[PDB]
Amino acid sequence: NQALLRILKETEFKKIKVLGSGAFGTVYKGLWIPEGEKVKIPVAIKELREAANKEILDEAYVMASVDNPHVCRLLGICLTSTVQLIMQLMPFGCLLDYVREHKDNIGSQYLLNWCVQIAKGMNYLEDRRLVHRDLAARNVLVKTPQHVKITDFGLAKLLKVPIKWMALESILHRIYTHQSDVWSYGVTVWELMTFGSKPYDGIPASEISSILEKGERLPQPPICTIDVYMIMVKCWMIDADSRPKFRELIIEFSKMARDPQRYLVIQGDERMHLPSPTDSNFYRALMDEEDMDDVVADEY
Amino acid sequence: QALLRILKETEFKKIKVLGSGAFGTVYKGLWIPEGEKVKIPVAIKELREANKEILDEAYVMASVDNPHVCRLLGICLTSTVQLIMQLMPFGCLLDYVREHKDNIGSQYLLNWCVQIAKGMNYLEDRRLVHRDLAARNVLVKTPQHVKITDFGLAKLLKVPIKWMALESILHRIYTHQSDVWSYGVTVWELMTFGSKPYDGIPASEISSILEKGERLPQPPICTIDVYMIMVKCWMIDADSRPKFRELIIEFSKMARDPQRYLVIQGDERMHLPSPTDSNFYRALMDEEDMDDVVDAD
Amino acid sequence: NQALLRILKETEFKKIKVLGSGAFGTVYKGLWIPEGEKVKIPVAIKELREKANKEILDEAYVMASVDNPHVCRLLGICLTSTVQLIMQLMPFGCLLDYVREHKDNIGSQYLLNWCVQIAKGMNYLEDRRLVHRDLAARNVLVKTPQHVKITDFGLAKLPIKWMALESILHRIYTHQSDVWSYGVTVWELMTFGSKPYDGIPASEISSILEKGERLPQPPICTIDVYMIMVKCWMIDADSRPKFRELIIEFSKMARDPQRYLVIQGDERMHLPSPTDSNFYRALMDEEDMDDVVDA
Amino acid sequence: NQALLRILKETEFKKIKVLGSGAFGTVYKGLWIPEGEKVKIPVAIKELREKANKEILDEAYVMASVDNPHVCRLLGICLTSTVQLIMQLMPFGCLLDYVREHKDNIGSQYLLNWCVQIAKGMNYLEDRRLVHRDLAARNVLVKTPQHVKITDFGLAKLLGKVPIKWMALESILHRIYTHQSDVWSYGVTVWELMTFGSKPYDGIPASEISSILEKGERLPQPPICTIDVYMIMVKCWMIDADSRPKFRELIIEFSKMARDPQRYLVIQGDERMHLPSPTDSNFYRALMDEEDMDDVVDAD
Ligand SMILES: */C=C/C(=O)N1CCC[C@@H](n2nc(-c3ccc(OCc4cccc(C)n4)c(Cl)c3)c3c(N)ncnc32)C1
Ligand SMILES: */C=C/C(=O)N1CCC[C@@H](n2nc(-c3ccc(OCc4cccc(C)n4)c(Cl)c3)c3c(N)ncnc32)C1
Ligand SMILES: */C=C\C(=O)N1CCC[C@@H](n2nc(-c3ccc(OCc4cccc(C)n4)c(Cl)c3)c3c(N)ncnc32)C1
Ligand SMILES: */C=C\C(=O)N1CCC[C@@H](n2nc(-c3ccc(OCc4cccc(C)n4)c(Cl)c3)c3c(N)ncnc32)C1
């Protein structure tokens, strides 16, 4: 439908503060003040740095379309010297910032659930036949810690290359496929379990293709179980078809979720607490009204 | 005509992504009747890939009227083709057995086998050839009531070489006797709790190996008496393979004494359905008349 | 008589290897050295699980007594703290084991022939009017692919799945009972060494026969072959075919092996030529015997 | 026989290297000097951690009495405050290590055969009435690529962390050891070989494992392992020992598979890697393997 995307007047919105920056565009926290109304509402706006707008509009129209709990939805667009994108605002920000910040605090149960939601969100993309082209811990967002959602997908299509994230087929031949996405998906999984460290740190981007060919893959994190790592390792496979399909990642991660403590070894995991039903429910009402699949602990 | 309903894209929506099938992508769905507040859960299959041709094939599928054959409720025609049928929460038997694999009854497994044959047999009666039959293609309306699906879908339009008969493989010949051979693979899938036949072996190799006689392994649970039935299905000469109609009786007889035929760890601990339990499932889950489940005599 | 059975001092023979463990006794590969002889000649020795020694000897004397192609004759007994039985070594060894190994590569003709061969041996035991009490595919030894010899017959002084209902119910052993034990043995061959009543507890065995739920019929087996097995297992001993009948039926069956037993790709795999077979007899089967039936 | 095993004076032999360490002992590569001879012969020395000396000799006498192609025999022992065990030294050493090194290029025909060979060695142990109590690939030596033998059997009884992952549940829970339990270890042994030396129940604490085995978890199908082979492993891991397969049955089942190895295991470039020619095998026999051994199953 063209119902999904809303055309926003520059008069309609103003940008109060800068949340973040991305290679594609700067981002803001914004107020949308409705025509004919008194109130001012918080929203997140990103304006592209460089910019066939009608061609883009066709792209945005799809971006608006997606309907998954774990996938971000593009509410609106504004066209000017610089294109403006309007979407829901996430206070928590990306997972990457969230995990790095919470490294001492974080516990086994959450990390796996996040992995599952990404798979769910990503799986929707595959069925929709959409290629994100950029899955990274940064790209994913937290509506709330329990609920996380994928984002910034198709932007490359809308319009500075992350070699360390990219799959070998991607690096060598500029080939992007859902399976390529897994390699990134694996990289993202590596990202969380490292609690925000940066892959292939200090290594020249140019050198990267050779190392993958050499088979010197990213090391497995101390917290990470070999069972979990092997899963990561599988994602990083030279042949894309060989790499696990998205569904499998959804199924396997969840099983771990049923028994989170055994798979991931985290200091003081037992002591740190997953949210109580009271804790999750409160968060849901205030922010997460949208009905999303209940998170799996199964042990507790 | 009366049997199959032609929907309007306005009429329903695929809300939840469901499953991946080589034949199709399956979506949980909601049906909104005009003038009505209510929404009805449906299963939607979207087919990857002549409008008239489907209708002839489609009408027959709407046609099937057996407890153990799923019927196609509606067809919606568009750049892509969507097949409407009732939603089964349990979905694949293959999914169900593997998920519940550690624990299952002898009684259930034989009963499914009996249930599958009754359905396959009916298709046989109707002169419908499945071409492709598998555990994956059989889904659970309810635990005691699995139903056979995707029948004849294969014929109309990745090939299941491991499932297929040698006669089917060698010259792409499909017959009811060819189906029977598949049934053993389906019977075999369950007794192994969801395993894969000729697992991981190349398809190219398989046609040669069947000739070599290197048949599927006997499952640990399986009694020889059960394994022999499968072996008969996989006989190279099609005609020699037992008819489903025979197949129904043998499993039904076995179901009378489930423990003697199939060996299970802690089966006694595991519970056959309570009569009360069976009735409760019927009331909400299953409202369709069907033959009664076999119970130990 | 005195001549038939040799009593050997422990000195005469030394065991070398454990081929297998019998339920009744352990079995070894042992070497026999003749007095003042450089040569060591291979034999197989059985040590009983472990009465009166004299009584046992009488039983051995009977066991020595049998001379038949399809029955095994005990050459030697050693009397000591533990009884030892010596009989000629067979490299193929167990019949039951042989089928399991060769199920993929085995021809139709051989299976029928073995059925005929056992039946004649069981029949000799019958004429002598001695009852085996324990016929098993395990207890038949392959002298050569074309020859088999039943053994472990008698051993009364010293299995439910094999055992006949009458024997199981009342500890009754009769020739008719031996036919029932024989019926299982055919199944084992046809099954290619399938374990009968696999996974089923022994306690269940008495009732199911009472129920009447039999051993299943093997895929290779023709309808005709299976029925013979079924006749053999019957509630009333008398109804079950005599061995002579079984010998006659099978041999008739052996004349046209293909019709009775259906084996995939049967034609390609065949019984060896007389020229080959002659080689087998001379090297191993020096013994006077019936030649194998040919279609 | 007394002759079979020889007591040795300290003076005759020395430990020139420490090859490896084991739960029982430290294994040293040592040379043996015969009196009045100018040359040294390589042997393998194992020293115990540290039961009267006479008591030990009786167990030891048994160890040196075992003649089988696939079961290792002990040449000599030295009585001391420490106890030293001497046996032939094989350059390939551990079978388990061999599999790890050779993952890149191990032929299908070999892997099935080692199973025949380990089983053959195991059956003899059963016939002899000896229960190994700690069978693992680690405990299987490689005399030659074609020929591998079983070692370290019966060592376990003398000592007083157990190898829990290998152990049958009966052993874990009630310290019960039987041939049937032994099959379970053999089953694990098959798993290690098939998976090219990967650790069993890796990353999982010992305490959980007895609990997990009851739950019904069993080690995963090796990626290169066909379903037929996996079932065989699975039976071994049965709770009811008696249902669990006997070795002779085990020997028979692998031999059939050996006839058509490619059918029962899938390895990349299995066609490329083929069993060594008779000329190649014959060469090996004479140089390091004079002793007679049972014929290898050949697919041809
Ligand atoms: C295959 C069944 C099994 O487990 N076996 C254990 C040893 C290997 C096989 N086997 N057994 C003998 C064998 C059988 C019987 C023997 O004497 C008993 C006996 C009873 C009644 C009459 C007579 C004359 N003997 C002996 Cl001594 C040995 C085997 C022989 N002899 N050769 C190869 N394999 C044998 C059965
Ligand atoms: C491979 C695991 C490991 O780390 N090892 C350390 C050295 C390399 C391997 N290995 N062990 C021996 C070995 C084993 C046992 C030995 O004597 C004990 C013993 C017990 C039971 C029977 C017998 C005959 N011996 C000795 Cl002395 C040595 C190796 C030998 N001998 N050669 C190469 N590698 C060996 C294990
Ligand atoms: C790691 C990212 C980070 O640290 N940021 C700083 C805080 C704000 C973060 N952020 N980005 C967006 C955001 C993302 C994407 C947006 O439009 C792109 C897009 C692409 C495809 C589909 C859709 C629906 N949108 C926009 Cl407009 C904004 C944030 C939002 N929206 N809210 C809160 N933080 C956001 C980046
Ligand atoms: C185990 C197979 C698998 O991976 N699946 C994906 C998950 C969902 C599973 N599943 N499939 C259907 C299903 C099957 C077939 C369907 O239509 C085909 C068809 C054609 C003609 C006639 C009939 C009767 N059917 C449809 Cl529409 C749906 C599921 C259903 N229906 N419910 C739950 N799970 C289902 C298979």
Residue numbers in the entry:
A (entry chain H): 700 to 750, 755 to 862, 875 to 1011, 1013 to 1016
B (entry chain E): 701 to 749, 755 to 862, 875 to 1014
C (entry chain C): 700 to 749, 754 to 861, 877 to 1013
D (entry chain A): 700 to 749, 754 to 863, 875 to 1014
The article reads:
In consideration of these limitations, we developed a novel highly potent EGFR inhibitor CHMFL-EGFR-26 which selectively inhibits EGFR oncogenic mutations including L858R, del19 and L858R/T790M. As expected, the crystal structure showed that the acrylamide of CHMFL-EGFR-26 formed a covalent bond with Cys797 of EGFR. The aminopyrimidine formed two hydrogen bonds with Met793 and Gln791 in the hinge binding area. The Met790 oriented in parallel with the cholorophenol moiety and formed a beneficial hydrophobic interaction. Furthermore, the Cl-atom formed a halogen bond with Leu788 carbonyl which presumably contributed to the high binding affinity. Furthermore, despite of the similar covalent binding via cysteine 797 residues in the EGFR kinase with all other irreversible EGFR kinase inhibitors, CHMFL-EGFR-26 forced the EGFR kinase to adopt a distinct “DFG-in-cHelix-out” inactive conformation, which is rarely observed for the EGFR kinase inhibitors. For all of the sensitive mutants, when C797S mutant was introduced, CHMFL-EGFR-26 lost activity significantly (50-10000 folds) which suggested an irreversible binding mode via cysteine 797 residue. Combining the results that CHMFL-EGFR-26R, which lost its irreversible binding capability, completely lost activity against those sensitive cell lines, these further confirmed that CHMFL-EGFR-26's irreversible binding mode observed in the X-ray crystal structure was biologically relevant. CHMFL-EGFR-26 showed an IC50 of 19nM against EGFR T790M mutant, 71nM against EGFR WT and 215 nM against EGFR L858R mutant.
EGFR is a receptor tyrosine kinase, which upon ligand EGF (epidermal growth factor) binding will result in auto-phosphorylation and subsequently lead to activation of downstream signaling pathways such as RAS/RAF/ERK, PI3K/AKT, and JAK/STAT pathways. The aberrant activation of EGFR leads to activation of downstream signaling pathways associated with tumor growth and progression. The first generation EGFR kinase inhibitors, such as Gefitinib, have shown great clinical efficacy for the EGFR mutant driven NSCLC, but after a period of treatment, most patients will develop EGFR T790M-induced drug resistance. The drug resistance is mainly caused by the higher binding affinity of ATP in T790M EGFR protein compared to inhibitors, and steric hindrance due to the mutation.
